[PDB]
Amino acid sequence: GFDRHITIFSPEGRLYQVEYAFKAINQGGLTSVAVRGKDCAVIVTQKKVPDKLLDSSTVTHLFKITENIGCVMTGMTADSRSQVQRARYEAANWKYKYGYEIPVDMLCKRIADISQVYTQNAEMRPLGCCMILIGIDEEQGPQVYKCDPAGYYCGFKATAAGVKQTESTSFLEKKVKKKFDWTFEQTVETAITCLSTVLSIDFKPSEIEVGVVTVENPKFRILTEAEIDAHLVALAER
Amino acid sequence: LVLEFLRPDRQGVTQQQFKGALYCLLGNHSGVCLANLHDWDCIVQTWPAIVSSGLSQAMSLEKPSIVRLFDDLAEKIHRQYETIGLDFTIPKSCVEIAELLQQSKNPSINQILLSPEKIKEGIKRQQEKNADALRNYENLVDTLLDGVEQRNLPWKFEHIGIGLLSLLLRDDRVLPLRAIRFFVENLNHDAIVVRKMAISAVAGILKQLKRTHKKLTINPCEISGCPKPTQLIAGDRPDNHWLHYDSKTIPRTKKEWESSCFVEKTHWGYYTWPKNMVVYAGVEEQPKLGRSREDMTEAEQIIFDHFSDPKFVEQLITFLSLEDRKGKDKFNPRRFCLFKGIFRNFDDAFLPVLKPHLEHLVADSHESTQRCVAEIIAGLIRGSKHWTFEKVEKLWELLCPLLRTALSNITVETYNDWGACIATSCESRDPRKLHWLFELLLESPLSGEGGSFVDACRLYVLQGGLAQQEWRVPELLHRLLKYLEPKLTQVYKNVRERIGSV
Amino acid sequence: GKLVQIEYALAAVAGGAPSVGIKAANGVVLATEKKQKSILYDERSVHKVEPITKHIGLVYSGMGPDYRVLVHRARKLAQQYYLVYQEPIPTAQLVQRVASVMQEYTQSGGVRPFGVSLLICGWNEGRPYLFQSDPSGAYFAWKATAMGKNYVNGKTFLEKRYNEDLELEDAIHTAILTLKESFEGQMTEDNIEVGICNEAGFRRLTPTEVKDYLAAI
Amino acid sequence: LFQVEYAQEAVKKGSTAVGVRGRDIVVLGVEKKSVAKLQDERTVRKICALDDNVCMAFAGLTADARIVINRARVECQSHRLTVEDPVTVEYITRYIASLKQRYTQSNGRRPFGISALIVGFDFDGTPRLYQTDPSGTYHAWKANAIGRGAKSVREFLEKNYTDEAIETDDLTIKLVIKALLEVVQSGGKNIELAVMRRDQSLKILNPEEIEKYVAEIEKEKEENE
Amino acid sequence: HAGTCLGILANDGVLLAAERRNIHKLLDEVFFSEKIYKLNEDMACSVAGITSDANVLTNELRLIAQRYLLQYQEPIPCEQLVTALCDIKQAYTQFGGKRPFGVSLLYIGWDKHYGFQLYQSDPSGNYGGWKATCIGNNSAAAVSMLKQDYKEGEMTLKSALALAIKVLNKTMDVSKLSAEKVEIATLTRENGKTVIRVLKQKEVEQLIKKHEEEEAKAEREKKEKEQKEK
């Protein structure tokens, strides 16, 4: 029937190819956790360098869409780079056309709208990637937003993507239900504890990559291995 | 309880309850319909209720679903209807086997033999049940007739009721006289759908009112004078010669017509003679034709009065003449059955009333007018089988001119209908009896006065008649071969194809 | 097959979250269920009920990304009419234009039909208007309609509750009741999104306003 | 291939059209089928004027004929605009055949599905009759027939066509009527006849006029008997 | 066969009468205008289809008439308007990459060339001129009824309206004919202007009343005739 082969409706009313695209995000085997605190938003992803020959600097899943906006990409790497390039172009065009930096919510909608086109048209396959965008909104404070291959986008207090997303979301839900607004140290701790618990890795500083945006410093910053180590050592002594 | 929701008098029934009850009456695709239940007692309650649901007040025909449910209820009833008993007596031979089964040892429970009093009680109950079933059947016809005649009933419900009434034709009993009057009167109902339903019903009523014809056993060897050879020789033989059509053999006299055997069906005599061969009784023994209407039974009188009236026939002829589908219309053998029944039962009593209409219909070249006359002509010829020589001769003096004009006026639209009329008229008949028609179409089929195509159509109508009489016309086939042989090199393509087929 | 694809698109709408529209003498109310799957989701981030113009608003049951494409087109169509005629677009005119875009997707090949059914409320010439548009491109005018899961059950409930003369405040209460019938859990101001159309024009009721109506029920 | 055969079936079912080329008159006659009790016959034509000097009779799908006739009529005016001369009957037939060869879409029922008898007079004054086919083959005929009974009508025409038959305008009209009368049986009720004439506009004979010619042929047949 | 549309041509006028049906109670009467759309001053059309299908076809037909008016500043002749739409329908069916239009339309109009006219367009793109015709639900029964009662050249608008009420009563599934459930429009020439008037509900109600009383008189006569025969 070609219902499974291309993005057309099934008898049940479901598009299987989008569901297959979601399976692709897990195929990479990496998990990303993003948490929104009272004054900051943080992204942590597991980074695995399979070969000693590979240069460590080149392998990254955290990218800077704009000076104040950064993203984490989970899924096929080449598809991830394609979405990152599209987001960067959209952000520049918005500043040129409207004279102000694109809001994180608006950028997630633009990428999600491009994603819907792939679901509607048979010739183009959906991209098997998840984009989590973190930024500080001047009006509404720290913002975490996630885009899907289906073209759905939503704002999240905390969110996860990857092989352990279902397990990661469960750990995050318990912390969000209890506790209170978290300080920057607590928000970085929550993300690292969540990834550590699901993957049982006891991460050394090299294994995890951390990206942060704060109300005090809106610009996106990737923490250095020493800064990640300081968070890890504090977590160990607790 | 389900019928209460669809009762017209009941108030506060609601749209939902009425729709649900109709679904319960429709039943599952597989399972109990609940409206087509075999017992008469169940059918008598359900069928009138569905017809009278039109006046319910909880019925909205405007909603499409309600109309779909009513159409489905009628369709399911029509497809799954089976005739329901009316007599259930068991033969004595069966009871004798049953008595032995009761008196069988091994897997046996000791039981007293049925008392003579008990056996009598069973006969009384069965007789009461069969009488009760007949009472219900007459009531169902009467109650359905009351429903269709309701002052303010939606048209769809009247159509559903007339279809249910059509299902009640019995074949073991004549229809109640009131119903016979309704169907003959509704022959000219304004709706074509009701008119077609009436045509089918009245043809069935005519078979019910038919009077049986006596038959005489005959010895084929004695009439032929041949020895009747023991070996199963097949094909033309000395014993089968009388059946063959010969110009000298054709009776052409009152005395000769009575003397001739007139076998009828083509199959008889070709392979072997039947152990008992029946040729029909003499005219005196056969039921008297030309009754005065005082003699005719009340049911026959109802059909006679309507058909005899000039106005009723004029309306029926106009309704029959009207086109229904352009280029999809055909002979409609049900119309032929109605005319054949009328002519066979009434012996050309209505022939004078129909005569002015037949002449006008033949003259008109319209495809519809020609089709209507063709059905009447085929029925008139087929209905003439048991008519006396004086009556048959009169029919042919009127028919020979009308057929000649019709064949002359044959056209692409009406050629097939005329072929059907000749084939239906010829089928199941003795060739010698139909000599007038055989001479009429064989005189000059390729005259060329009409032109090409008309000649091919005239050859085609003749071919259909010759095909129906198989092996019983050794001559005529020879005469056609002689006529065709000179014209074989002088014909156009349309005629050539027809000559090849013949 | 294009017709089969339309039937399949209708199935996706039926599987979609329940949405209810009620038209009353002074206003039209559009109500939808927005149950966030997890405590993690931010309720205020995304809105199911969206304004097309000052006097026109729309709600949907079905796929949300597909719904967004239609809302952008609908907002553009409203602006194009305003530029040419310098008057707010009649709601019936907008629904006809929105329907044409959905028909184009069904007719064309290599593109699936939209999987979203749209309920559009508008106020023009002092008369309330409520309309429903299908993936097929068909549009109907409804005094009350329910779309999404348990739409058939919701529509029958609407038949008993609806009165020809109703105030908008009463209409809001019945619309919430229709959603309550098919709501799996407790209904809260965050869980349900409600939009009202009046002489003032389409507005999305603030969560504080929704809380007051929920308390009354 | 299959499409061309399907088009040929449609033309075979079409109303018979017979045309004769005469010294001063080209005659086109088409049988007129009955329509319906409540229908109006004005819409059904089957004989169309492509231009002042050219007339066409068609057997085949009515809808496809309308498109071909409109395109041909626009071409006749375009030819007159470009060259200033009336279209030759051969030129219009060649254009219609080319249009039949390509419907302008790949596949998409490329054969138009109408067989056309095109009759008219050249600027020189030469009478011309041509036949167009769904295949796109176009031929010139002294007399020809298309539609139901065409093969039988052609054989009658082959025997009947003679110098004596085309000697006078009335005789040429009678020859067309006699050939049509074989395929279609009636008087003037089922026959439509158009006479182009020479250097004169196409004239469609009124029902009374066709009946008078039909009456004369019957009288001649009675005298022959 | 979405809804029954019946057109009758009479010596003084043409009328299009169309069924108005409510599938659901909650559906509004905004589309109660139904058929008799008004292509131009002299022409009107009825569509046997859903309202969405009718709007695309009616808008294209109005555009064709207006384009004629811009070029010639005179109203489009009725046959030309029907032929132009039929060509678009034929092209969609003829070309492989298109789907044929599924709506059959009935057209009533007055032109200087042929006077009052009624036309029918099939989804195929073929059109016919009809003295009287029906499209939509139960079309077959209506066409049979029209042939039986139509008198060619003797019909008057009043006789045509009465035939329409009689044929609609026995073909429409209304159960009881009501002014709300039937819409009738009349095209007539007054002075030098063609006037298209949708009959008012009070006027339509009067026609239903006249039909009902006439039916009662016939029923009373039938009972009296049976009594006389007895």
Ligand SMILES: O=P(O)(O)O[C@H]1[C@@H](OP(=O)(O)O)[C@@H](OP(=O)(O)O)[C@@H](OP(=O)(O)O)[C@@H](OP(=O)(O)O)[C@H]1OP(=O)(O)O
């Ligand atoms: O002998 P019956 O059972 O009463 O019926 C026979 C016979 O029917 P069978 O050959 O089947 O017994 C004929 O043939 P059918 O065409 O009915 O098969 C005949 O019909 P034709 O008039 O067409 O020859 C006619 O039946 P009917 O006249 O009722 O149609 C005739 O019955 P009769 O003995 O009453 O003539």
